[PDB]
Amino acid sequence: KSEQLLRIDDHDFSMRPGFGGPAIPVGVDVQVESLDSISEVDMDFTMTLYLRHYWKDERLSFPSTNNLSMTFDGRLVKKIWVPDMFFVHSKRSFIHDTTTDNVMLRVQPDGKVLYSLRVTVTAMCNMDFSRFPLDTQTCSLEIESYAYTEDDLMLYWKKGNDSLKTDERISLSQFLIQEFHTTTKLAFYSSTGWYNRLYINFTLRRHIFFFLLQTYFPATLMVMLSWVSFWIDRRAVPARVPLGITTVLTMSTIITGVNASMPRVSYIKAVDIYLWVSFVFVFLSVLEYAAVNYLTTVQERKEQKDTHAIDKYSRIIFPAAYILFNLIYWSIFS
Amino acid sequence: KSEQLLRIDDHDFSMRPGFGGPAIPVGVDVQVESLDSISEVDMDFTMTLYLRHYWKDERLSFPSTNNLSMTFDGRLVKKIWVPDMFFVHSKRSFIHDTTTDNVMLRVQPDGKVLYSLRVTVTAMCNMDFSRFPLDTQTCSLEIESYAYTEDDLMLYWKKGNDSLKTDERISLSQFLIQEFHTTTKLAFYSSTGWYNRLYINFTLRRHIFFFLLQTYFPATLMVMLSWVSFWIDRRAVPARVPLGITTVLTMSTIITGVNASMPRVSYIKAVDIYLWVSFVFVFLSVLEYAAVNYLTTVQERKEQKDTHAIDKYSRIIFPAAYILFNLIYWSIFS
Amino acid sequence: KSEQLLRIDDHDFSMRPGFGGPAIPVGVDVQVESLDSISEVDMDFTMTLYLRHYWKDERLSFPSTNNLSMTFDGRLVKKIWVPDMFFVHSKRSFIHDTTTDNVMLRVQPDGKVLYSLRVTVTAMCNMDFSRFPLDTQTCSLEIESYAYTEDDLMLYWKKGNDSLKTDERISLSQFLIQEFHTTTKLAFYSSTGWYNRLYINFTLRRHIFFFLLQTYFPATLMVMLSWVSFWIDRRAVPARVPLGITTVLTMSTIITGVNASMPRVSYIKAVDIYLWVSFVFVFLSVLEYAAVNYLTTVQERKEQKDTHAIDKYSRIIFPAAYILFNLIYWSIFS
Amino acid sequence: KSEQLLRIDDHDFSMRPGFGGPAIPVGVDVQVESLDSISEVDMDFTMTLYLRHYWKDERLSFPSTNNLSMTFDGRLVKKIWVPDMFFVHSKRSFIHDTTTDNVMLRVQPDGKVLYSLRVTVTAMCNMDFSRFPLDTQTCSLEIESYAYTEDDLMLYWKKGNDSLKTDERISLSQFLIQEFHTTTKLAFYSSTGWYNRLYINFTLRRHIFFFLLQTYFPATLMVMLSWVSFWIDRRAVPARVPLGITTVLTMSTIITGVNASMPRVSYIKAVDIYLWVSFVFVFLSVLEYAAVNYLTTVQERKEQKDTHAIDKYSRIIFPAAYILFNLIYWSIFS
Amino acid sequence: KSEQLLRIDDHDFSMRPGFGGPAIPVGVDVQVESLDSISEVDMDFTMTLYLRHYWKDERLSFPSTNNLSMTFDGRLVKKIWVPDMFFVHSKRSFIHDTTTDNVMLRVQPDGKVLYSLRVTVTAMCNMDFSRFPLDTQTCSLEIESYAYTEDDLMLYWKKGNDSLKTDERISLSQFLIQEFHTTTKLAFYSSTGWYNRLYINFTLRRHIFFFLLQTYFPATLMVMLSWVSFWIDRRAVPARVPLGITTVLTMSTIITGVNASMPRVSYIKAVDIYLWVSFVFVFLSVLEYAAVNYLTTVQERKEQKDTHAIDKYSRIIFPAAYILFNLIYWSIFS
Ligand SMILES: Cl/C(=C\n1cncn1)c1ccc(Cl)cc1Cl
Ligand SMILES: Cl/C(=C\n1cncn1)c1ccc(Cl)cc1Cl
Ligand SMILES: Cl/C(=C\n1cncn1)c1ccc(Cl)cc1Cl
Ligand SMILES: Cl/C(=C\n1cncn1)c1ccc(Cl)cc1Cl
Ligand SMILES: Cl/C(=C\n1cncn1)c1ccc(Cl)cc1Cl
Ligand SMILES: CCCCCCCC
Ligand SMILES: CCCCCCCC
Ligand SMILES: CCCCCCCC
Ligand SMILES: CCCCCCCC
Ligand SMILES: CCCCCCCC
Ligand SMILES: CCCCCCCC
Ligand SMILES: CCCCCCCC
Ligand SMILES: CCCCCCCC
Ligand SMILES: CCCCCCCC
Ligand SMILES: CCCCCCCC
Ligand SMILES: CCCCCCCC
Ligand SMILES: CCCCCCCC
Ligand SMILES: CCCCCCCC
Ligand SMILES: CCCCCCCC
Ligand SMILES: CCCCCCCC
Ligand SMILES: CCCCCC
Ligand SMILES: CCCCCC
Ligand SMILES: CCCCCC
Ligand SMILES: CCCCCC
Ligand SMILES: CCCCCC
Ligand SMILES: CCCCCC
Ligand SMILES: CCCCCC
Ligand SMILES: CCCCCC
Ligand SMILES: CCCCCC
Ligand SMILES: CCCCCC
Ligand SMILES: CCCCCC
Ligand SMILES: CCCCCC
Ligand SMILES: CCCCCC
Ligand SMILES: CCCCCC
Ligand SMILES: CCCCCC
Ligand SMILES: CCCCCC
Ligand SMILES: CCCCCC
Ligand SMILES: [Cl-]
């Protein structure tokens, strides 16, 4: 029996190695396999990865006439001491178990141990949509010991920044992913003390040009279309009136359709400001002709008892104001 | 073996400490990690937190030449007595178990015990949408002992209002969160007796200005647009008629689009009252011109065999009535 | 050890109390905590409740110098006999287990037993939507023994109609709930025999006035709007034609929007009949003017080589027919 | 102890009854409780049922002074041999376990056994939507032994066609259900051999008249509406043009709305053919007037330097072609 | 007892067969039962299959007077050594367990073993939608040993390309499936070494003709409809203007409706390019008439103080440009 080469019943494996003395160092490496999904309304993401641990325990040393190591599956985990890592700020997680538990232990003759398992985790990520669609988001995954303070267990990245590897074809459908790196920081709990925490950081971006074509283009086109009435004969009322009202209807169907396709986030974003300002422009172009038609009728009635000046000024004033608004908007939102 | 320092087989751990006598006090602290989601149709919310217990048991005392405590994981829980807390009015819950069970026990030399675990819970919350979007909601989470009355177990907040801590970046996508505090109250069951219950309370609010721009603005604009026809020559029938009917169509597409984007709650809310009143105003503006055109045709036919008075009065009467409705509405709904 | 006061190893707890003789009576009480959700497409509902059992077993009697009872958690259930209740016509269910199993047993000195647990269940409910939105639905939850016929186990409500209690704030978002009561009935299985079954019954209703404002109001308004053309000068073709076609478009957008918001039930309901009849009325008003314009052109051409009679009759005939349809419809559907 | 009446430790219950000799016959009965849901996109359905087995084992015989049988719950299943049935072509399944495992065993004095359990299963069903909404679908559920060939275990329906019972109120929301019956057939696996398989078959149909009113009615009405322009004075251009373009818009909103409400199946179905043909008819009616107006203008200009023949022919030709298309369509698709 | 024919307690089944020496070969066969679902947004698919293993172990040999083998269920798996296969790049998986665990073991007298189980797996698949709806996708499922390198375990397809079988009625609702085959490749891990990996490959395609009718047809029809105004009398302003604006509205409702029905993938696809170009064409046709009407009014006013040339050129220039765009587009995207 291989479990008799390790004197399992001769030691108390409910206490850590080096109990009573300096803290035992534990090194960690991570390999990220994929990014599975992201939820903008609930503000979280899901990832699948491999987690590896490295430490030394003299109680597991065994004699050997060679330098070969012994390998075990997850059934041995319940008989020895192992570190208790958990994921901070997570919502759910599980360990894969097909066709059996995805766990491995390798023991060197001198007592060095490698501990490897495959896991899937869902973690929270606070997001800010004020600058949508030109927003940038930063996310992280955090690892910590549940019950051991820094006086008993010292947790660190085994090879610094070389301890993190990512798959060559990692991707998300609606985002671009960049800038993976690691950091560390100490955390304080009033109930028990100080703990060391490890982080994995990355950044997300959208495809701007899609949103530009999809949203900003049609609104600008309809605003330019509403200016055509300034060049039409003012005597053609049955042509001037339906044009304006139909332009208003069209802008409304555009805005409704654009709403239906964005994530349901109930506060003001940049693209709403652009859309609503454009709608106000279309509205004012209808009031302009109402004033022209009333003044012309008044003059004709007075007389019985050429281009109007308002059209001449509007032809210049409307585009300049729209250009100025665009300059200010794009200087503010980049 | 550390489990031999506690005389586990020398006591009956199916009975509480102090059995036969006064009730044993149990103190509680809570740390809230995040708010995960909220469902308006099903009327519930989900939260993740840390739950800590504190009590004393002389049967767990052990000799020591120092003042160091002993720490255990969840495997010891099945060998000793622990309190049986459950969440009242909950729909589902679970205890996190990656990479192992997220449970800890710490025992002092004199028998003081700390019991800590990490849990996620979904709880009901009755909501009232009568004043939407200007509504305010209050929610709570409740903690109680399943099997012990106040004569056997006395449950209380360990440090009063200082027993509740919340994470600095707690947030929801569509709500603002304020005013966390704790309370206590006694509850009666006819089957078994009196129990003490603990509460955690908080309040939610919406972003009003978003809904104002999104809903109230376009309806007011279309109502003002329908008044333009009062200043148009009454002889231009092919201009007057299509304007009114197209305004009605536009208001209808607005209302349908607004419905499609609100939570599916099938009873009357304030924003429906505003929308429907606006639609009635647009409808009456079309009936006005129908009457004008009939009367003018009658006069002309009679004669063969200037502004009409109705337009002159409507130009004044319609805006005043709308302003009065707005005053009453906003005095009622704040 | 408290489990030595009951002679657990001196009896066979795989057989019922009173084996060999008359059936053992078992009384039941129920406390309903909440109604969690309802699904109209799948035709089911979900509820959370407390279930309590009461029976006597002389094998559990123990000596005592007082009249105090002993209390146990779920770990004792596997050592003694307990009744095997299940829910008939259910789709899924589970027993709550945070922070431990929500089960309790209380044993009197003379052998009386109380057995209490907390459970959540999803059950089927056949619904009929023919009269929507004026429909009424009735639902039930059923309880039965899996393996014991009425010759071995007699199941009954412990206190008649007083055995059912409901929470003071039970509610659903889209329904009104009334008329809770209990009944009993015997059921026959050809495989094994007769069993007694218990029922919990209640009734659901909708908020009619919401649906009236939301659906019936706009359709009636558009039907009345289509009658305006009967009072317009027949010589104004470019006013008469676009009015009718735009009214048809508006009614179509209303019907599409109303469909998008009802539960996806693919058979004919009352509100469809009202909507479709209204659409036919709008369609006939356009055919009326087509006939008028053709006849007028024919007369003018014939002559070269006042109000038309059709308008005069339509002005009377259309509203009377619509009023008659409304009388018949509302006498049929209440 | 009742488990000592059966000599459990005197036999090897890892081998079947009659090992070494002819195959042991096993009879099956099924009672269907409900049909829970159906998914058209994923092509599967879900059902809840009772499954009963019947066989004889002389090793379970026990002495008795009467003819009474002994009943056990699921805990005895792990101590004796039982048949290993599984569901072929299923996606998920589970056995109900509230308030305990829904399993029963009944043993006669002579060794006859009844084995009963309650289960829910989701199974695949390939569907063909070519004839939608006039399609018909056939589904089945299949039962088979996992590890025993027909040489060791003989599986059959216990009472032929009388072995299948269905609940009196079984129903689905969007389908009609008819024609339950059973069959059997032998299956071959190259890895191990021949196995006998049992089937349960049934058929589904839709409510045609709903779809007729919902889809075919409005399209026919708009096609008939487009024919009105053939009777309108050709000199009234501002009446003829907007009518046609608005009819095209209305047909487009109808088709979009109809798409939004059908299951997302991305290939051509019959109702698409009808809709698209109707749209082509509306399109050609606009080209007709374009040609009329150009020819009239040419004639007038030529002259300066009554009904047109095209209208007269169109008034006859358009309805006849539409009627012929309808005859062919409904002779093809029934 | 059959488990005494195999000397289970006389061997250490924590080490592989042939420990210390050359690697043990393990052959694999796969039978695919169904394809359950596919998710385009999350980029994964789900499949149900049978997995079979074949190897030899002299420790399991037993005496026999015949050539009959012994069969066991999953309970024996925990007592002997078996291979530890897992699925690479998977998101979740499970082993079916109704009515018991779907596992089988068959042992020959000479120690040959067959190991069979039924499993369902969800696996990732990166997709590219640039050419939608004319895109083609390739997917794979991968199998690998968790803990044994190629020096200890040699994994291979048992019968080459004949080791893969697929069900005769495998299908997906929205895709066509072709070209199943197998491959193998060696993989390197810096943590432990080289491993052999097996692949199952297949290809997916869409139904093009559906998308052609659904999207490309209406846009082309509306572009052709906008050309009608070039043949209309330029003096009929109240006919020319509403036609153009209504055509713009119709194209907008078409594009919105087409968006609502495609998978929510936020980057530019081919069908967007076609739609947006068509919209620009419709927009330019309105600017054309605006210029014509202004120039005509200028000429008339100048004079007071036939076909216009622009119409004559547009009648030729617009269709040629559209045909050229179509030629380039369909030469690029096939
Ligand atoms: Cl965006 C919208 C209407 N909604 C459509 N879906 C939900 N709300 C709107 C908001 C502001 C303005 Cl100025 C115009 C419009 Cl049309
Ligand atoms: Cl809100 C709606 C129609 N619906 C749109 N989606 C669902 N119902 C409506 C209700 C009342 C009035 Cl006066 C006008 C309208 Cl347009
Ligand atoms: Cl209700 C509908 C169209 N649909 C909208 N969504 C789904 N179908 C309709 C049915 C009958 C009649 Cl007469 C008119 C109409 Cl517009
Ligand atoms: Cl059915 C559709 C547009 N879509 C709406 N939703 C998705 N596609 C269509 C197809 C063919 C024809 Cl000839 C006309 C139309 Cl409007
Ligand atoms: Cl596709 C769309 C609007 N959207 C509808 N749903 C979501 N966005 C659009 C994009 C570009 C152009 Cl040139 C015209 C239009 Cl109408
Ligand atoms: C905080 C931004 C407000 C923008 C208002 C736009 C009004 C058209
Ligand atoms: C009409 C669009 C104007 C865009 C100007 C952009 C200035 C950065
Ligand atoms: C980061 C993209 C900015 C786009 C500017 C557009 C100005 C019209
Ligand atoms: C209880 C509020 C009713 C509001 C009716 C509005 C009618 C336009
Ligand atoms: C036309 C909008 C009027 C708003 C008045 C507000 C009174 C509080
Ligand atoms: C709490 C916001 C009230 C808004 C009043 C608006 C009156 C037009
Ligand atoms: C069974 C009700 C049929 C109603 C048809 C309505 C036609 C407009
Ligand atoms: C035009 C609506 C008529 C409603 C009449 C109601 C008769 C009960
Ligand atoms: C139960 C409500 C009946 C409503 C009748 C309305 C008649 C116009
Ligand atoms: C295979 C059916 C094609 C139908 C094309 C319809 C074109 C209007
Ligand atoms: C205009 C509809 C014609 C329907 C004819 C039906 C022939 C079976
Ligand atoms: C099975 C129903 C056929 C319907 C024929 C309708 C012909 C207009
Ligand atoms: C990369 C493709 C851009 C297409 C732009 C289309 C503008 C109408
Ligand atoms: C107007 C459609 C033109 C299609 C041309 C196709 C060239 C391959
Ligand atoms: C693979 C299909 C190509 C379709 C070409 C259509 C050109 C109008
Ligand atoms: C649109 C502005 C009109 C100005 C009237 C004085
Ligand atoms: C909306 C009316 C405008 C009048 C300007 C004199
Ligand atoms: C744009 C407003 C013009 C007013 C000139 C009198
Ligand atoms: C948030 C203010 C934006 C201003 C754009 C002109
Ligand atoms: C719109 C009101 C008309 C009044 C006719 C007497
Ligand atoms: C709708 C008709 C109005 C007539 C008023 C005299
Ligand atoms: C607003 C109604 C006006 C009526 C004047 C006769
Ligand atoms: C709308 C009915 C017309 C009658 C023609 C005889
Ligand atoms: C639709 C044409 C009507 C003709 C009546 C004479
Ligand atoms: C409503 C139909 C009127 C016909 C009178 C000739
Ligand atoms: C609509 C067909 C027109 C025929 C021109 C020759
Ligand atoms: C679309 C133009 C039609 C011209 C027929 C002569
Ligand atoms: C329907 C086409 C008619 C053509 C007659 C010249
Ligand atoms: C549409 C192009 C107009 C050209 C004016 C010079
Ligand atoms: C949009 C105005 C066009 C003017 C060309 C001269
Ligand atoms: C299509 C542009 C035509 C311009 C001819 C002057
Ligand atoms: C991506 C460029 C497409 C060009 C089509 C003409
Ligand atoms: Cl006109």
* DSSP class per residue in D197-257: EEEEEEEEE--HHHHIIIIIHHHHHHHHHHGGGGGS-TT-HHHHHHHHHHHHHHHHHHHHH
Distance from the alpha carbon of residue E170 to the mean position of ligand 16, in angstroms:
39
Pocket test for ligand 7, best of A223, A274, A328, A330 (most atoms within 8 A of CB): A330
Q: Who contacts B145 (Cβ-Cβ below 8 Å, separation ≥6)?
A: B83, B84, B85, B86, B153, B155, B195, B196
Tokens standing for residue B150: 């106040």
Set of chain E residues whose Cβ sits within 8 Å of the Cβ of A48: 91
* E260: nearest CB among A34, A174, A260: A260
Residue nearest to atom 1 of ligand 11 (CA): B334
Neighbours of D165 (CB within 10 A): 16
> Which secondary structure element, helix H or strand E, spans residue B156, and what is its range?
strand B153-157
| Protein residue with least CA distance to atom 1, ligand 36 | E314
Question: Facing residues of C88 across strands?
Answer: C142
Would you give the end-to-end CA distance of chain C in angstroms? 69
Among the partner residues C124, C245, C301, nearest to D247 by beta-carbon distance: C245
Q: Where are the domains of chain D?
A: 5-207, 208-334
Distance of CA D67 to the CA centre of its chain: 48
Of residues E186, E89, E190, the one with CA closest to residue A162: E190
Closest residue to atom 3 of ligand 12, CA basis: C273
Size of interface B-C (CB pairs under 8 A): 136
- Number of DSSP helices (H) and strands (E) in chain E, helices first: 5, 12
Token pair belonging to B58? 């002389």
Q: Which amino acid is at D259?
A: N
Q: Is E272 helix (H, G, I), strand (E, B) or coil?
A: helix
Q: Closest Cα of chain C to B69: distance in Å? A: 25
Beta carbon of B156 within 6 Å of any ligand 2 atom: no
CA of C214 to the centre of ligand 5 (A): 30
Residue of E206, E238, E250 with shortest CB distance to D249:
E250
Contact B124, B89 (CB under 8 A): yes
Q: Confirm or deny that A116 is annotated as ligand binding.
A: yes
Q: Taking Cα atoms as reference points, which of D245, D298, D248 lies closest to residue E233?
A: D298
Contact yes or no for E233 and D268 at CB 8 A: no
Neighbours of D151 (CB within 10 A): 10
What's the rounded Cα separation, in Å, for the pair A149 and A192?
8
**Residue minimizing CA distance to atom 1 of ligand 7:** A323
Which residues 195-254 of B are in CB contact (within 8 Å) with C? 237-238, 240-242, 245-246, 248-249, 252-253
Substitution target from C12, C90, C120, C232 for chain D, most D beta carbons within 10 A: C90
**What are the pocket residues of ligand 14 if the criterion is a CB atom closer than 6 Å to any ligand atom?**
C 208, 330, 334
Give the residue, out of A273, A275, A327, with the most ligand 24 atoms within 8 A of its beta carbon, to mutate for a pocket test: A273
Please count the other Cβ atoms lying within 10 Å of the Cβ belonging to residue C19: 12
Query: How would you classify the pairing of strands C90-95 and C112-124?
Result: antiparallel
Ligand 34 binding pocket includes E249 (Cβ within 6 Å):
no
Any D CB within 8 A of C15 CB: yes
CB burial readout C265-291, b (16+ within 10 A) else e: beebbbbbebbbebbebbbebbebbbe
SS3 state of residue C19: coil
| Three-point CA angle D88, D89, D93, nearest 5° | 80
Give the B window 280-309 contacts with A, CB below 8 Å: 306
> Using a 6 Å cutoff on CB, does residue C228 contact ligand 26?
yes
Q: What is the distance in angstroms between the Cα of E121 and the nearest Cα belonging to chain A? A: 9
Helix or strand or coil: residue C320? helix
Give CA separation, E247 vs A223, D280, E217, in Å: 17, 16, 15
Chains in contact with chain D (at least 3 beta-carbon pairs closer than 8 A): C, E
C325 CA from centroid of ligand 14 (Å): 13
The Å distance, Cα E117 to ligand 3 centre, comes to 51
CA-nearest residue to C206 within chain B is: B266
Identify all chain B residues contacting A287, using CB atoms and an 8 Å cutoff.
228
In the numeric block, the tokens 């399993």 are attached to D103
Resolution of this entry, Å: 2.1
- Contact partners of B by the rule of 3+ C-beta pairs under 8 A? A, C
Q: Which of residues 56-85 of B touch A (CB under 8 A)?
A: 71-73
User: Is the beta carbon of E277 within 6 A of some atom in ligand 18?
Assistant: yes
**Method used experimentally:** cryo-EM
CB contact under 8 Å between D14 and E33, yes or no, is no
- For ligand 12, atom 1, which residue shows the shortest CA distance? C268
- Residue B159 in 3-state DSSP? coil
Q: Is the distance from CB of A170 to CB of A38 less than 8 angstroms? A: no
How many Å separate Cα A115 from the centre of its chain? 31
Mutate to test the interface with C, among D34, D98, D248 (most CBs of C within 10 A): D98
Name the residue with tokens 């720490």: B71
Pocket of ligand 5 from Cβ distances under 6 Å: A 213-214, 217-218, 257-258, 261; E 252, 255-256, 259, 276, 279
Reduce the secondary structure of chain A to three states and give it as a string.
Answer: CHHHCCCHHHCCCCCCCCCCCCCEEEEEEEEEEEEEEEECCCCEEEEEEEEEEEEECHHHCCCCCCCCCEEECHHHHHHCCCCCEEEECEEEEEECCCCCCCEEEEECCCCEEEEEEEEEEEEECCCCCCCCCCCCEEEEEEEEECCCCCCCEEEEECCHHHHEEECCCCCCCCCEEEEEEEEEEEEEECCCEEEEEEEEEEEEECCHHHHHHHHHHHHHHHHHHHHHHHHCCCCCHHHHHHHHHHHHHHHHHHHHHHHCCCCCCCCCCHHHHHHHHHHHHHHHHHHHHHHHHHHHHHHHHHHHCCCCHHHHHHHHHHHHHHHHHHHHHHHHCC
Phi and psi (nearest 5°) for E267? -160, 170
The response to whether residue A212 sits with its C-beta less than 6 Å from ligand 8 reads no
CA distance D241 to E229: 10
Please identify, by atom number, the ligand 30 atom nearest to the C-alpha of residue C313.
3
Between the CA atoms of E247, E252, E254 and E258, what dihedral angle is there, to the nearest 10 degrees?
160
Residue E281 Cα to ligand 37 midpoint, Å, equals 15
**Ligand 20 binding pocket includes E334 (Cβ within 6 Å):** yes
D288 CB near ligand 31 (under 6 Å)? yes
